[PDB]
Amino acid sequence: EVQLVESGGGLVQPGGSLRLSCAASGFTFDDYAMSWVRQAPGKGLEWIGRMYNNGRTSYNPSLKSLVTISRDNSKNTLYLQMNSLRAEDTATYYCARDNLGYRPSENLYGMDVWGQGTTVTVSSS
Amino acid sequence: TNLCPFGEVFNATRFASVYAWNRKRISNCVADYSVLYNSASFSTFKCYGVSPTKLNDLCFTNVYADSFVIRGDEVRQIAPGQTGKIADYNYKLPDDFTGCVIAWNSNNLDSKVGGNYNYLYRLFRKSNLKPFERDISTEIYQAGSTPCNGVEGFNCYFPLQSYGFQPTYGVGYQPYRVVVLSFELLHAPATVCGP
Ligand SMILES: *[C@@H]1O[C@H](CO)[C@@H](O)[C@H](O)[C@H]1NC(C)=O
């Protein structure tokens, strides 16, 4: 069963750093492109970044200075390292696999499998 | 009298990717194709427009050797009139192609246990290639309705995907070194001749 699970979210003070995980089941990252997507409470899905199979990263150009995407193929986890979380980063972070293969119809996002996503909140307490 | 440098082509340590396939001009030398056809190293040896045993008896002009690395089951696309990702986006042969397509397994050379990512193929392109046309552009592809403006995002991808070459993968996902020879048959003063 192809399944993505994310972990690491929770409360975080402003200006801190926090890591996320995208532990995968049923497949590996050696031949798939895997992406991080952000969902704000009042806005739509915002694409954070993408890891390819060869290890190259692409980022959101309005978000490049404070995110980092790294793999661990030994445990098939994708990591997302934020730095300096501010008030507009209070959002639900999904991890989803890019569909570079067959698309049965027009997809707005191009994602064949999604994760359940984890909630990160930045506030005073 | 000087021999053609076929050893510099087939026994090269590094081969190009299929999107950036290397082309070498073979000219002004004597070519012995009997050591290629009788060699048991080549799994695929398909000649078009010329018999392989008649190669020593002809003199050729404009001899070109195109070398790249593709995966195992895609060797069938290096032929005239084929369709798929290699034929349409990476390396297209013309319908009137004359020459020889030589391919052999290189799993012991081009596979690393962690995965060899130095060989890449153009997964996405807006249009089919013309024959013998090389596309090395790395412009960000638009796979959806929303334009990319050179920045990846939703349905916006890097057009080159690398093969994951591991020794554990079966035949079909294993690296194959492909050398394509192209000739012109007896119309100009010829510089490459058989013995
Ligand atoms: C490449 O090396 C092998 C090693 O035995 C040799 O037999 C072969 O002749 C070489 N290829 C050419 C084209 O000379």
Author numbering:
A (entry chain E): 22 to 146
B (entry chain B): 333 to 527
Lines from the paper:
The global average resolution of the map is approximately 2.8 Å, with lower local resolution in the RBD regions, but local refinement yields maps of the VH ab8–RBD interface at a resolution of approximately 3 Å. The interface between the RBD and VH ab8 is well defined, with key interactions at the interface mediated by residues in the stretch between V483 and S494, along with a few other interactions contributed by noncontiguous RBD residues. Residue 501 of the spike protein RBD is at the periphery of the footprint of VH ab8 and shows no evidence of interactions with the antibody. The presence of the mutation thus appears not to influence interactions between the RBD and VH ab8. (C) Density map in the region near 501 for the N501Y mutant spike protein ectodomain showing density for residues Q498, Y501, and Y505. However, there are marked differences near residue 501, which is completely within the ACE2 footprint, at the very edge of the ab1 footprint, and well outside the ab8 footprint. The location of residue 501 at the outer edge of the contact zone for the Fab ab1 complex and outside the zone of contact for VH ab8 complex provides a structural rationale for the findings we describe here on the differential effects of the N501Y mutation on binding and neutralization by these 2 antibodies. Consistent with these measurements, neutralization experiments carried out with VH Fc ab8 show that it can neutralize the N501Y mutant with a potency similar to that of the unmutated form, while IgG ab1 exhibits a slightly diminished neutralization potency for the N501Y mutant relative to pseudoviruses expressing the unmutated form.
The most prominent mutations are in the spike protein, which mediates entry of the virus into cells by engaging with the angiotensin converting enzyme 2 (ACE2) receptor. Despite being phylogenetically distinct, a common feature of both the UK and South African variants is the mutation of residue 501 in the RBD from Asn to Tyr (N501Y). X-ray crystallography and cryo-electron microscopy (cryo-EM) structural studies have identified N501 as a key residue in the spike protein at the interface between RBD and ACE2 that is involved in critical contacts with several ACE2 residues. Mutations that emerge in the receptor binding domain (RBD) of the spike protein are especially of interest given their high potential to alter the kinetics and strength of the interaction of the virus with target cells.
